Design a protein around this nucleic acid. Sequence first.
DNA 1: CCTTAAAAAGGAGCT
DNA 2: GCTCCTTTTTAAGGA
Length: 232
Amino acid sequence: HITILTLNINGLNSAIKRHRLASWIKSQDPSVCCIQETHLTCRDTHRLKIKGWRKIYQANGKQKKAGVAILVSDKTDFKPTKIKRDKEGHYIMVKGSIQQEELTILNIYAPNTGAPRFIKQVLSDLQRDLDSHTLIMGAFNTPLSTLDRSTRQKVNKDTQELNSALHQADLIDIYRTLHPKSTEYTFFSAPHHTYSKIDHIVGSKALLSKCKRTEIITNKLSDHSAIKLELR
DNA sequence: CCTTAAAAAGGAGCT
DNA sequence: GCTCCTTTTTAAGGA
């Protein structure tokens, strides 16, 4: 009955916001929580501590940009096999077992420019470590369907190539496919008064089966919205 | 590429 | 390491 919660926190270099995120995570009580864009540099890795979530695996560059992290609840059990940390801090893959069941989580943050090509280059750069139990989530910085933009301007070529490279490895957009005809968005761009869903949850089709519920959470922490996923 | 808004990060000047 | 203000950063439409 585990729950996974993805969020683009947009910077964590102030201790006050760190305690705010602490309280928010305690209130949400996720089995696993995926943070993107911590803007934490590796020197500062040790500053991300949240009581009740002792196990934290981040990936940080040497500049206050990007920075991903995966937090595991003390209430749950997590036995990791192998962990791959991006040298630049844009993705981290944690592979192992959650409640005895196998699971490989890819927490990804793509740059805004050339986002779909970056996502697929990582996706096929790692596929030997990819498998049938995969869960790739995070800050895609790109739409996937035409409904992921309020403008509804139908989707770029690189993005549909990505939605089909998902296909050639049998990965599918858990949210788009447990929720098509969606008008829920994760990011609001003020300079344009537009809305988009650039944050995503994308898993193996094997695990369709297990996926029970998805949800989208407004918060006071970031200009992005969090995505919750119930697993049983 | 260039511009935007608005928040995150940085920096001056004192504590 | 502050307060208060300046600069950088980040998503995204328009040329």
